[PDB]
Nucleic acid binder design. Structure first.
Ligand SMILES: [Mg+2]
Ligand SMILES: [Mg+2]
Ligand SMILES: [Mg+2]
Ligand SMILES: [Mg+2]
Ligand SMILES: [Mg+2]
Ligand SMILES: [Mg+2]
Ligand SMILES: [Mg+2]
Ligand SMILES: [Mg+2]
Ligand SMILES: [Mg+2]
Ligand SMILES: [Mg+2]
Ligand SMILES: [Mg+2]
Ligand SMILES: [Mg+2]
Ligand SMILES: [Mg+2]
Ligand SMILES: [Mg+2]
Ligand SMILES: [Mg+2]
Ligand SMILES: [Mg+2]
Ligand SMILES: [Mg+2]
Ligand SMILES: [Mg+2]
Ligand SMILES: [Mg+2]
Ligand SMILES: [Mg+2]
Ligand SMILES: [Mg+2]
Ligand SMILES: [Mg+2]
Ligand SMILES: [Mg+2]
Ligand SMILES: [Mg+2]
Ligand SMILES: [Mg+2]
Ligand SMILES: [Mg+2]
Ligand SMILES: [Mg+2]
Ligand SMILES: [Mg+2]
Ligand SMILES: [Mg+2]
Ligand SMILES: [Mg+2]
Ligand SMILES: [Mg+2]
Ligand SMILES: [Mg+2]
Ligand SMILES: [Mg+2]
Ligand SMILES: [Mg+2]
Ligand SMILES: [Mg+2]
Ligand SMILES: [Mg+2]
Length: 152
RNA sequence: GCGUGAGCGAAAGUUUGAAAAGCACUUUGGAAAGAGAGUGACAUAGACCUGAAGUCGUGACAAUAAUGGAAGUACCUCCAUUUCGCCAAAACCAGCCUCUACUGAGCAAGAACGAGGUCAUGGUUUUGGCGGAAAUGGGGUGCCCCCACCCGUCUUGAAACACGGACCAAG
RNA sequence: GUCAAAACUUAUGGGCUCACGAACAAUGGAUGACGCUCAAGCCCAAUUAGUGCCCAUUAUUCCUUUGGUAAGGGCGAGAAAGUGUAGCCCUUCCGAUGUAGAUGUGGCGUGGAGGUAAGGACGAAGCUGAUGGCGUGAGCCUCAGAUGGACCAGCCUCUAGUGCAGAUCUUGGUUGGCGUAGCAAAGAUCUAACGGAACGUUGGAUACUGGAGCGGGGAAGGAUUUCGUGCCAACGGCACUCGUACACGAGUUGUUCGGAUACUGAGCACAACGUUACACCGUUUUUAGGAAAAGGGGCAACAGAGAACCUGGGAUUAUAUUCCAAAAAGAAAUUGCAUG
RNA sequence: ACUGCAGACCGUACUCAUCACCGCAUCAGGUCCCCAAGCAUACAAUGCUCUGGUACAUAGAGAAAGGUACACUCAGGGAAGUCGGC
RNA sequence: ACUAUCUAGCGAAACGACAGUCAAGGGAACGGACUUGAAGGGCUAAGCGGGGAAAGAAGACCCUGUUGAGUUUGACUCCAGUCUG
RNA sequence: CGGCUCUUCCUAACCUAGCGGCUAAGGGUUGGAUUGUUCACCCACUGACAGGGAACGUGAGCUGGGUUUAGACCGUCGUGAGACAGGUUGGUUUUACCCUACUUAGCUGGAAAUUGCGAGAAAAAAAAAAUUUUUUAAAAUUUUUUUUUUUUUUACUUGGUACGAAAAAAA
RNA sequence: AACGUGUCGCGAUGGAUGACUUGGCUUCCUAUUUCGUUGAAGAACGCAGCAAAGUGCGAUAAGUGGUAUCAAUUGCAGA
RNA sequence: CGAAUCGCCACUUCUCUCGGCGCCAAGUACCUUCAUAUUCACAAGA
RNA sequence: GGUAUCGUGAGGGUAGUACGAGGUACUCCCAUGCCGUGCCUCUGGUUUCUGGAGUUUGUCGAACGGCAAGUGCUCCGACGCUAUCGCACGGUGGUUAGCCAGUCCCAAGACCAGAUGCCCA
RNA sequence: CACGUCCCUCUCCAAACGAGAGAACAUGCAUGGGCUGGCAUGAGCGCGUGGGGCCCCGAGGCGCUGAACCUUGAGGCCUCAUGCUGGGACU
């Protein structure tokens, strides 16, 4: 299961989505933004990044990705606005505020403590390239898991 | 499965567990799924023994061509051993090392006295320092100074602007 | 002189030198660099001065190893008559590089076997390892697994499908490049309403195809793609609520359509006969008695020849020149037999 | 003439194509036949239009350089370009 | 006008020893690794095409091999066919 | 091969410049006809139409005329297939999205060049104005007085800021 | 700082390894052992209450009959 | 926050061709504290 | 320590050139070419302001208004972009034409104890 | 948390994207007007080839009519007139 056990089981909510069918590299970016954030400011960052009001700071999986001015917030020039990945993150954060609520915990004091998008087993599909070749297409679905303690 | 055809022709261990007891029920989700709960000795045994490498994610940590060698040192050591002996320093002995004669003032020239050095030399302890820790060793990470042309290859000659060389596993 | 160890730029040495000087034409730039000029240059000599120092895998010496088919001694725990081990012990001496290659090895390690000895559910193998320890080394051993779940190490002997970074090696997996290159051919969608968890549906708008059509039927080919309901996990290189996808259930109706029954054609080939080591060949009639009640049998055209049917339907989710029911919606033609 | 009975077999869905066939594919390639409107026009050229069909070809924002084009325009000169009016 | 550019979705390939600033030098005789100098904070985005003797394919050139195949022939050795007896 | 394109470097200097052949690499060194060309030769201009290097600079820049495989023609050679550095004609020019260079374009660190606390300033060495002298809170922490700024009731380009006033707050 | 690098702890991807092995390979043997026009081998199509494949079978169709054997088959159902 | 460093100064701290002092009594008189910090060991002190 | 502003300028780049005429055989003039740095008033070019007009075929029943012809086509056409096809400009000092410095261009990884504004929980 | 920076938003002397310049309740944006330009005389009604039986049909023409329209938008002018008017991030 979780790479890191929550410090205080009763005070934290865990959530996860295995074989999430969003790009790993985009979801890798999208979930890492959240890793220290309070859940409401993380619900927010996504609602705002879903509006093209703010960007997810792509960091590791930059590549020749385009420069944006909304990335200044994050300390670098490159940034990006996944939607499929931002929605899955909200949809996994709903999962935990639900998990957090049942524990009697208060979702709006709750803080993201551990986000970890592992890359999942990949799905094959086929190209059909120039001179009779057939190279791979492969989605790179991510395993995202997280928990969110609220402070004591 | 492939080929008009003659023909070619795979991969695949359902090896979960003793048994299916194969996760009822609650909870969020449109769902997939998730969080609890439950079964079982174990579910990081969940349709699955083991569970490597490589690769990746994450946390913490040290940090600032690569690798590499040598030697230290900084920090860390889930390591070893030892001590309730370890680090030192001085001495003694041994070893070892260093530091007249002739000639017409010179040499082609010989020892002596004295003193010093030293254990990465041998034997003799002494004296202090340290003693949940200390101590020596190993390991790890960084640095420092220094050394250091990618390997395999055929070739007189390879660092070659010569060939082969992305990674790992099995063979 | 610095880099660079050493003349912290030594000489209480000689000369020489002003501009260069320090063994084997074109990217800017090379006494190695700087810089040096009573030199840090050159010739000469020197070593503290008329009273040296620095650096080797070298030498010497010391320690250790290894080898010697080298020289001796010996036989608190040990003392083995020994090539070789954890070497029987001690002493002394000499050697040590090395490609191709040769050889040694009580050398390492693997699967298996004959033995021996032992271990394991108080956890075997395997795997993990700032687990140390041992060994020159191949490696072994221990520790720890918050690893595993049932086998198995030692030792001597036997055996081999026995040791892998490299073969543009094989096979599997993974990777950087990289969220990149792209997904830019055929002009196009817009709107509201509804649906839905969130692209479809309808209306409107707008274009397009432009009758050699993103039209309506067929052949070949395909063979369920058809249709409806559902579905959208996967696939539909974006998305889908939709699909030629998935699942389930349906669906193709003939006296007359086409085909065969029933033509011949380019052709083919059974039979027979012949040839061939052999029929899996050839002629296509057979030296041949082919009639069963002059030239054997057959096949070969879904575009040739042949060929009795038309419409209407309020008849389907899907078929109709095929379905319709007694007023056959009906109207025909046609074949066979039979009937007045 | 009539009437009576009988009239058997197999095909039959769908496709026929920038997604149903062949091309490893829903591949800009290929693949026989038939029907085929109106206007301009000499017309089956071309353009456009009723019918029948489409709106499927991933989309968005904006409009660096360099490109592609079944896109143009260019003063004065007029082949001097180039191997060659390509 | 479509690309490119930036975005949402989706998403390869080639290539890949390792890398990757230069000048001189030497050197397998044109270094990214070596010697000596000179630079160089790191990471980026779009271009670009100089270099990486960039990639492509065990040079189609050439030579070698007691290797092939095609063709030729009054090469050697033959074999059908033909004709003659 | 050549050209084109672009840059660059050299000089046994063509022009220009200075001299009196010398120095001088600065900047410049033309457009055309023929031919693939280079080269040469021509025409015209020009101050002049200099010579070279840069992998005989420069094909993932192009072009593909030369060279140019297969097709074919001719001459010669060959018995022939075929040969000819003889002629003729026709004859796919692939890939950057890597690294560096470069070109623009951003971001961020950094002075023990990320550390040490490892400490160096092109600084000054009671203050200001005319080295010395004079002026700038006082009196018993709080109170009073003075000065400056903000708000309210002429000179600046001319709307809005300054000095005027008066009051309040701060030093 | 960031990225990137590196160590460690977890986790994912991956499927090695080890154990397993109703399989293969090889050797050997045995016998009342050798198809078919009495329709063979092969091919086709079918048959189960739910059955695609595989197996079994052949419109008597996962079987009829004889024999032995026994109380099952077993996914569900069914006797 | 434990650190390494171990002379100062307006007598050098101008120029152009034995600086002073400090080193254990603020002084040359040894008045006078020093131990066990037990013979080196970062000076245990600035 | 932030943030902001004005600057410094080590270092690097670096460019002007040629011809002619006049004037008197230097100075001094005056044009031009090339180069370079810009700019777009004018002039030219460019139009997807499809601006306005005209116009062809199809089309909207017709006029109007359109619309389609992948911008239908023709004329004019602003903005803008741009042209030696327009226009403006191209500076010194010091040393031995060179060369260096400057002007000119980038300029603190040249880490600027330069200045400055604001806040420094 | 201060000051403030940034994003979102608006503008463009900027611009591939970042960056830039600005704005930050502002004639800022929006329409409208006026202007400057462009084109070139709209719709609509009210001399003429001939033609048809005083009118009708008539391309073209005339008049209202330098009209009509367009004129800032990748971003002409005018305040002329009316209209509409902060959140987030960070330290
Ligand atoms: Mg790009
Ligand atoms: Mg980009
Ligand atoms: Mg193909
Ligand atoms: Mg497992
Ligand atoms: Mg050789
Ligand atoms: Mg030295
Ligand atoms: Mg040896
Ligand atoms: Mg074996
Ligand atoms: Mg390790
Ligand atoms: Mg083997
Ligand atoms: Mg892209
Ligand atoms: Mg049309
Ligand atoms: Mg359907
Ligand atoms: Mg199906
Ligand atoms: Mg015939
Ligand atoms: Mg027939
Ligand atoms: Mg027919
Ligand atoms: Mg028929
Ligand atoms: Mg139908
Ligand atoms: Mg049909
Ligand atoms: Mg058709
Ligand atoms: Mg037509
Ligand atoms: Mg046509
Ligand atoms: Mg022209
Ligand atoms: Mg010409
Ligand atoms: Mg010419
Ligand atoms: Mg020419
Ligand atoms: Mg070869
Ligand atoms: Mg030979
Ligand atoms: Mg042979
Ligand atoms: Mg060349
Ligand atoms: Mg090149
Ligand atoms: Mg610092
Ligand atoms: Mg079956
Ligand atoms: Mg101390
Ligand atoms: Mg505006």
């Amino acid at each position: 299961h979780y790479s890191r056990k929550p410090q205080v089981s009763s005070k934290s909510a865990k959530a996860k989505v295995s074989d999430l069918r969003c790009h790993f590299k985009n979801t890798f970016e999208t979930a890492n933004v959240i890793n220290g954030m309070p859940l409401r400011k993380a619900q927010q960052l996504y609602r705002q990044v879903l509006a093209k009001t703010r960007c997810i700071p792509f960091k590791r999986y930059n590549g020749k990705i385009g420069r944006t001015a909304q990335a200044k917030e994050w300390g670098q020039t490159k940034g990006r606005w996944p939607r499929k990945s931002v929605v899955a993150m909200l949809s996994l954060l709903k999962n935990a505020e639900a998990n957090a609520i049942e524990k009697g915990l208060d979702p709006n004091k709750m803080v993201i403590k551990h986000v970890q998008v592992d890359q999942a087993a990949r799905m094959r599909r086929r190209t059909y390239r120039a001179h009779g070749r057939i190279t791979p297409y492969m989605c790179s679905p991510c395993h995202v898991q997280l928990f969110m303690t609220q402070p004591q």
